[PDB]
Amino acid sequence: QISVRGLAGVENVTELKKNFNRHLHFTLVKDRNVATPRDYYFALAHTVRDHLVGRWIRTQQHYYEKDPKRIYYLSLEFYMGRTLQNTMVNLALENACDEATYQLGLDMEELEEIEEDAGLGNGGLGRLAACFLDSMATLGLAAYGYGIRYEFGIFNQKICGGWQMEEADDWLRYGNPWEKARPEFTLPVHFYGRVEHTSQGAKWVDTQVVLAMPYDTPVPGYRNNVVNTMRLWSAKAPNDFNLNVGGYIQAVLDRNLAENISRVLYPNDNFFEGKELRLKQEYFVVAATLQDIIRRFKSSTNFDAFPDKVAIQLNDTHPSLAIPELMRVLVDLERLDWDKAWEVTVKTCAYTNHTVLPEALERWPVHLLETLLPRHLQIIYEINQRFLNRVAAAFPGDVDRLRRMSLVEEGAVKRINMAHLCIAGSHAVNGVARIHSEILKKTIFKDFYELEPHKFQNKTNGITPRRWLVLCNPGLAEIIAERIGEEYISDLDQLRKLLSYVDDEAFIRDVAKVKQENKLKFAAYLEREYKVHINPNSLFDVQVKRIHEYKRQLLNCLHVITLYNRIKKEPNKFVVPRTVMIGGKAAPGYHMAKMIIKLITAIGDVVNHDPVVGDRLRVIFLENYRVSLAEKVIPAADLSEQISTAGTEASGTGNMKFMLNGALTIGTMDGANVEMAEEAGEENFFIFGMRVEDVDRLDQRGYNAQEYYDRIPELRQIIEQLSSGFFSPKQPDLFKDIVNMLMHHDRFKVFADYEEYVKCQERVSALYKNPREWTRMVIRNIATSGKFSSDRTIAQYAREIWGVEPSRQRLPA
Ligand SMILES: O=C(Nc1ccc2ccccc2c1)C(=O)N[C@@H]1O[C@H](CO)[C@@H](O)[C@H](O)[C@H]1O
Numbered sequence: 054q055i056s057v058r059g060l061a062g063v064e065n066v067t068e069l070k071k072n073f074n075r076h077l078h079f080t081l082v083k084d085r086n087v088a089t090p091r092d093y094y095f096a097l098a099h100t101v102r103d104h105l106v107g108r109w110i111r112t113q114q115h116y117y118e119k120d121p122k123r124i125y126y127l128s129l130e131f132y133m134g135r136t137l138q139n140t141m142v143n144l145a146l147e148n149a150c151d152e153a154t155y156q157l158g159l160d161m162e163e164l165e166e167i168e169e170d171a172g173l174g175n176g177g178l179g180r181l182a183a184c185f186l187d188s189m190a191t192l193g194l195a196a197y198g199y200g201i202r203y204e205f206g207i208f209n210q211k212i213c214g215g216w217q218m219e220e221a222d223d224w225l226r227y228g229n230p231w232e233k234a235r236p237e238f239t240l241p242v243h244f245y246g247r248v249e250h251t252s253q254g255a256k257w258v259d260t261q262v263v264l265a266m267p268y269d270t271p272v273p274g275y276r277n278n279v280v281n282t283m284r285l286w287s288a289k290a291p292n293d294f295n296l297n298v299g300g301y302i303q304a305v306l307d308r309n310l311a312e313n314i315s316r317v318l319y320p321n322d323n324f325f326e327g328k329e330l331r332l333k334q335e336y337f338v339v340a341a342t343l344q345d346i347i348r349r350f351k352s353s354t355n356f357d358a359f360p361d362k363v364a365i366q367l368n369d370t371h372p373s374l375a376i377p378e379l380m381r382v383l384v385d386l387e388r389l390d391w392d393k394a395w396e397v398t399v400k401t402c403a404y405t406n407h408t409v410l411p412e413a414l415e416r417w418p419v420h421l422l423e424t425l426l427p428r429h430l431q432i433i434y435e436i437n438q439r440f441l442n443r444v445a446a447a448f449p450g451d452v453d454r455l456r457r458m459s460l461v462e463e464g465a466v467k468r469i470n471m472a473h474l475c476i477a478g479s480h481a482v483n484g485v486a487r488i489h490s491e492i493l494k495k496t497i498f499k500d501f502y503e504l505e506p507h508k509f510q511n512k513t514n515g516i517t518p519r520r521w522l523v524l525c526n527p528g529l530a531e532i533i534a535e536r537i538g539e540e541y542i543s544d545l546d547q548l549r550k551l552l553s554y555v556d557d558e559a560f561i562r563d564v565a566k567v568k569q570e571n572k573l574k575f576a577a578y579l580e581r582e583y584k585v586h587i588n589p590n591s592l593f594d595v596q597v598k599r600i601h602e603y604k605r606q607l608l609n610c611l612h613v614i615t616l617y618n619r620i621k622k623e624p625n626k627f628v629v630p631r632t633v634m635i636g637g638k639a640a641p642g643y644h645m646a647k648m649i650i651k652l653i654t655a656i657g658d659v660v661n662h663d664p665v666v667g668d669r670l671r672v673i674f675l676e677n678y679r680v681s682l683a684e685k686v687i688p689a690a691d692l693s694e695q696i697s698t699a700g701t702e703a704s705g706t707g708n709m710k711f712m713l714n715g716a717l718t719i720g721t722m723d724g725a726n727v728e729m730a731e732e733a734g735e736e737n738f739f740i741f742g743m744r745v746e747d748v749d750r751l752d753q754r755g756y757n758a759q760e761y762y763d764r765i766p767e768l769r770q771i772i773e774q775l776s777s778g779f780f781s782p783k784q785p786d787l788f789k790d791i792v793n794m795l796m797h798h799d800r801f802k803v804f805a806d807y808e809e810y811v812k813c814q815e816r817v818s819a820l821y822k823n824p825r826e827w828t829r830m831v832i833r834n835i836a837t838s839g840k841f842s843s844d845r846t847i848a849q850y851a852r853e854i855w856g857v858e859p860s861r862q863r864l865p866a
Contacts, residue, residue: 055531059145061152069153072100094167098230105271109280116195122857124196128182128368132174134680136231143273169224170681172206175322176599187517188847190274190281192859198283199342205317210638210677215654232268239266242340248427257428263311264289265341278864286341288314321640322599323413339374360400364855367404370415370471376478377432404475404482419467440477458500476501481854483510486704486725514704515843518545525684528567545842552836565828575689588668591630592821596694600639600646603701608803614771624665629818636675655780688714695720698801700745709841715831732837737830741813742806761804
């Protein structure tokens with residue numbers, strides 16, 4: 054059908070069709086008379102998987118021969134989404150499979166909707182890991198993703214009476230055709246026990262053993278025949294575990310205790326909960342991974358070359374135990390001296406920070422580490438002592454620097470600061486956008502920066518143009534390719550060439566056409582799967598991301614209510630119609646975030662059924678926001694809401710997805726928004742609100758929300774409506790907590806940005822009245838979105854952190 058989806062050769066189509074029938078018969082044990090769409094999905098999945106195998110075995114054998122430096126990306130989260138379409142795209146099989154399935158009398162797009170998302174992540178940090186694996190394969194790096202195979206990923210969100218209900222994400226129920234169990238590579242992990250000191254070193258003894266079983270998932274590069282590996286550990290009890298009939302039975306049933314380690318992903322987005330189970334997960338992935346790393350290195354005695362052959366990237370502090378675990382192995386097991394072991398560790402490890410919010414930082418109580426990991430605590434104390442000696446020597450007599458920089462936090466409960474541990478034990482520390490990285494140097498890690506300025510770097514985040522353009526928006530990818538060819542898909546800087554098409558009337562028409570088709574298709578999806586009705590001619594105003602106070606979904610709510618009140622005041626006046634879509638999950642125990650969801654639905658209940666409003670304003674809450682839903686709503690959007698309080702969103706990546714797919718951005722000068730506006734030109738961006746400096750000034754003075762309430766009549770009206778029960782007639786005080794929070798304890802200064810936000814929103818509406826000028830500004834965004842490709846991000850990591858050269862050269866097919 055379309056060019057970028059590859060060739061549908063006579064011979065390829067014939068082969069696909071016969072392997073499809075072979076798998077349906079031999080693999081699924083079905084015949085065409087009983088087969089359901091799910092059976093058809095699986096036969097296709099298995100048929101496409103067959104094409105990976107040859108390339109996967111030869112990629113891995115190639116690494117064994119050439120022995121390049123290996124990159125180990127350690128993460129507790131990999132937010133993968135669906136795999137079928139992505140595999141077809143990267144293998145150039147999409148059109149062939151489309152043809153082959155059509156000839157079998159099947160609709161491939163219908164089959165693609167049957168795949169479960171691999172939802173092994175919460176949000177941004179998890180999806181970054183997924184984009185990174187794609188880019189590393191595409192750039193020909195010898196890279197491995199290492200994490201946990203959660204039986205249950207992020208929960209499915211259902212909305213019931215406006216409230217969020219959580220249900221288990223049983224994603225493995227029908228099986229996962231993409232993974233390959235490797236039980237033969239199972240490894241032991243130790244917990245608890247005690248430390249014994251001998252003539253020749255410390256020994257960790259009397260431990261409980263949990264087995265770690267790896268599952269390998271292929272990661273194909275873009276049309277380069279490279280297939281890398283994502284290895285995910287699963288927890289298994291040993292067979293002498295807990296080993297009378299009641300006693301015998303119970304001992305077998307208690308195997309569950311060990312296997313609970315890999316059962317479920319913690320659903321917290323930017324908040325730290327000090328739970329033992331979570332600590333076990335963190336050690337589990339670290340201990341199993343490091344043994345695999347060492348095994349692979351030994352199959353290349355001399356650990357001097359270890360950092361020449363190994364890089365370990367820590368995705369936040371979650372796998373921070375890699376540092377003392379590497380020390381433990383090198384000192385206790387390999388018998389290296391401390392200082393040499395430490396040199397190796399530092400040169401091997403690097404740390405990426407993803408947030409500045411204090412409540413998100415990992416601070417493990419000492420008594421937890423004492424019981425679960427007694428040897429690691431000793432190594433940590435030893436690391437701390439040697440580190441503080443260096444601080445003392447560099448800043449003599451600065452006793453307060455010593456307590457500020459300590460890995461050990463004293464107080465009610467003693468805690469270990471894992472961020473401090475990572476900085477001390479890594480040769481490189483980076484933030485995820487230029488503004489975020491500067492904030493790390495000037496505020497939270499200022500002391501560490503003064504000690505070791507050379508450690509601190511920036512690596513602005515990116516998103517893969519494969520999943521986030523070609524896969525989810527084939528229409529846009531095609532019209533771009535018509536003008537500038539296909540090479541941009543792996544070299545996104547080439548989109549700049551679209552600047553010379555900004556006054557091209559054909560191109561303007563095509564861009565606007567692709568968007569309207571995306572909007573029609575999404576409007577249909579809402580009717581079919583959710584029986585909700587929207588005007589596809591209205592402006593699609595969307596904010597999708599995790600529900601958090603810092604992200605200020607509440608500021609969006611205030612604008613929405615303002616528009617509604619303005620309409621009710623002047624019903625027969627013209628306003629640009631909007632569909633306001635807000636989606637995202639709240640962490641199960643975050644009361645305020647759950648209250649915000651209820652507020653959103655409550656506004657919709659009033660707004661969507663007011664006859665005077667008509668189809669001029671619609672408020673929709675997008676249920677169960679996840680990777681596969683993002684792939685649908687992002688191409689359909691006109692306006693991207695990126696309205697976090699300046700200084701709080703480290704980078705953001707949703708912002709980039711929208712820019713690449715033809716939405717204009719309303720946002721604050723926060724995270725990557727700053728660099729996006731810089732690339733496109735500020736005139737092509739809807740920037741409003743306090744900058745970081747303005748937030749600082751307001752804090753020095755003290756934030757008084759009352760002041761804004763007193764001086765803004767429109768804001769007063771909204772608050773009074775909330776208090777009085779306008780949006781909750783049967784529970785008049787339902788939103789008292791929200792009002793109280795806004796008036797008295799607002800950490801994120803919602804009121805302070807309200808006026809500029811509403812003002813700027815009027816400028817958006819004005820521009821949308823002029824279709825040709827809207828579209829020309831759109832073209833200016835798409836054309837400057839090149840910097841935000843994860844290929845760029847990964848090449849910077851490779852060159853400035855890992856010390857390896859990316860390559861676009863094909864491996865033989
Ligand atoms: O901190 C994040 N997530 C988590 C996830 C689990 C956690 C568990 C315990 C404590 C903090 C946690 C933070 C996160 O997603 N941060 C986001 O990372 C993105 C990728 O770098 C950024 O774009 C985004 O700005 C940032 O908020």
